[PDB]
Symmetry: C3
């Protein structure tokens, strides 16, 4: 069986639909008792923002602009295609509602509760200017060598 397996996802994309796929896979994995690590890098870091604990305190101006102007939480992420001003996302969301397919923010709550391990790429965090306190509290800041050690120890590795 799959109960001792390990999966590692590098979530690079900050697209709603790619994030959804990554959490559909991670939640299903956790239900099969697979240990799941999601390493968020670049745009994927946007998945990890906690809107209730955002800040502008002691960031450069570029960092402030980036933080205020980008999606402030997972649910605000744009579609990878057909976003159409936010209308084609509105489409996908409606079709999901018809099937009772849970929204990204509910899949993310689910993944946190099932103890999917979420890591934020240190260099991406530094470049984009996010503080630890701006992300969910159980997120750990991980450098790329820690990503590689984890990925090499894993049974399934994907870049999303």
């Amino acid at each position: 069986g799959m109960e001792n397996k390990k999966m590692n996802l590098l979530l690079f994309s900050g697209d709603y639909d790619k994030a959804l796929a990554s959490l559909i896979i991670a939640n299903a994995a956790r239900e099969m008792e697979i240990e799941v690590t999601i390493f968020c890098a670049f745009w994927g870091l946007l998945l990890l923002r906690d809107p209730e604990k955002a800040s502008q305190e002691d960031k450069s101006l570029y960092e402030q602009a980036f933080s205020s102007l980008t999606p402030r939480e997972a649910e605000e992420l744009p579609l990878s295609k057909m976003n159409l001003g936010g209308i084609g996302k509105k489409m996908l969301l409606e079709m999901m509602k018809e099937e009772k397919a849970p929204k990204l923010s509910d899949l993310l709550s689910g993944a946190r509760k099932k103890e999917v391990k979420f890591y934020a790429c240190q260099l991406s965090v530094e470049i984009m200017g996010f503080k630890k306190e701006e992300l969910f509290p159980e997120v750990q800041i991980m450098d790329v060598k820690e990503y590689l050690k984890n990925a090499l120890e894993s049974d399934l590795q994907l870049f999303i």
Copy 2:
């Protein structure tokens, strides 16, 4: 005895081309190939001569009617230009005698690449099994994971 699993998430012509170039070559080396199509990737599996509108919601009918109807109609991931920079790629491929996507797909089907459609995507998007190629099987995410964990090479495209 090797095995490869590709998760085709993208519905882009060029990414689909890459996936089938790799899948066809792997079958020639006697590697067993599984392609799990999810979200936009499902569009690869549409049989245009079998399309249907019966028992679909409004958005499902609209999504069906207004997305690529078959693999050859997929857009480029880049410089598609409303079909024109896809038209560039196709001309460049013609000069080099590189087969089109639909010909790679026919080859994949003949070589018995195993094509699967992600159940949740199929349901969300409203596609029926009869609208897809006959040998496609519906598989859920847990079945994908089992198959991927048993594979020797796993990619997300």
Copy 3:
């Protein structure tokens, strides 16, 4: 002991950057790294001190002249806006003294990352070996599969 294979399909500045951050770090940990560049990913390998238009078709000549001529010219995957939001990412990296894509590429070359160019893509897009960095080897998809199957980490970017 360990081996990593990256298939770089994307020709985006930020995706190439991710790939070379990973590749450079892997080399420091003594992991063997193979990067197979295909389709848009081939643009990473263009040597701007070498370019040629000689013995190419019209679309090949046009493609060569109009596309990014070296890694540093690659567009952002998103929010490129004229190259100005790339300008934004670049200025943010500069504040952090994060190395540029060209510096990571030079580092990768120095650390003996193995760079291969997909033969079919090369032929379609019309690039010649002489237009790419001298250590690049042209490899077909079956060589890609052999190498990926012997690797411990395999990603498609």
